[PDB]
């Protein structure tokens, strides 16, 4: 890999500089290089890895949605035929998005999840696995679509089982996992009732645990609880 010659610590240092510069593609390449050193990631390093790829794929997803919308309008009645360019360019962005998701899933499988023994790291990586299969599912249309969806569901479910056993209901990663699994149910699995039930129960169990938290932990947890509430407001 192109980062093979750079020190692990220098890659982490440069990932933080890239974040400050909003250079998220660089940030992701630096963090991929750090993962490929083969050592486990600290909590801060896991967050850098996630932030980097979240921003890269987030831009790709936004572009794909713009192009898919244009493509859909081109297939409506009365729409003028414009040739293959819209489909071609949507496919270009789609293939690049799929490539990033495959890269992330590859890092999780080689060998971040295998070596993650603590609840916090294992849940973090399994949530990531669910997330990037969910992004693959957003664009899937072929005979692998059901398998992609089940891969997301399976990863989220394993993360949920560990998180419920080993983490408090206010833990921000537990909360973000539940938030994302609820979005998976609503947007991907055609299960809005399951999505709403999960968001409600997650919110209520966190509320009951806030009294145990310091001021700073309270702020971290309520930030994610507000996203659950925002979704419930959209959905009900």
């Amino acid at each position: 890999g192109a980062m093979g010659s750079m020190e692990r610590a220098s890659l982490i240092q440069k990932a933080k500089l890239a974040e400050q510069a909003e250079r998220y593609e660089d940030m992701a390449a630096f963090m991929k290089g750090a993962v490929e050193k083969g050592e486990e990631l600290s909590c801060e390093e896991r967050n850098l890895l996630s932030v980097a790829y979240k921003n890269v794929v987030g831009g790709q997803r936004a572009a794909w949605r713009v192009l898919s919308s244009i493509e859909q309008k081109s297939n409506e009645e009365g729409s003028e035929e414009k040739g293959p360019e819209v489909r071609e360019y949507r496919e270009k962005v789609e293939t690049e998005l799929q490539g990033v998701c495959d890269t992330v899933l590859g890092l999780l499988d080689s060998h971040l999840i295998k070596e993650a023994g603590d609840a916090e790291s294992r849940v973090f990586y399994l949530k990531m696995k669910g997330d990037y299969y969910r992004y693959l599912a957003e664009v899937a249309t072929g005979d692998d679509k059901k398998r992609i969806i089940d891969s997301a569901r399976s990863a989220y479910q394993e993360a949920m089982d560990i998180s419920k056993k080993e983490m408090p209901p206010t833990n921000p990663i537990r909360l973000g996992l539940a938030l994302n699994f609820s979005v998976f149910h609503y947007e991907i699995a055609n299960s809005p009732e399951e999505a709403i039930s999960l968001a409600k129960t997650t919110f209520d169990e966190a509320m009951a645990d806030l009294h145990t938290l310091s001021e700073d932990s309270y702020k971290d947890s309520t930030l994610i609880m507000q996203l659950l509430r925002d979704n419930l407001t959209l959905w009900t």
Binding site: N47, S50, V51, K54, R61, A62, R65, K127, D131, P172, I173, L175, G176, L177, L179, N180, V183, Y186, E187, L223, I224, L227, D230, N231, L234, W235
Partner: peptide
Amino acid sequence: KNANSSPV
């Protein structure tokens, strides 16, 4: 985006 998801 259709819904809110986790910042990390």
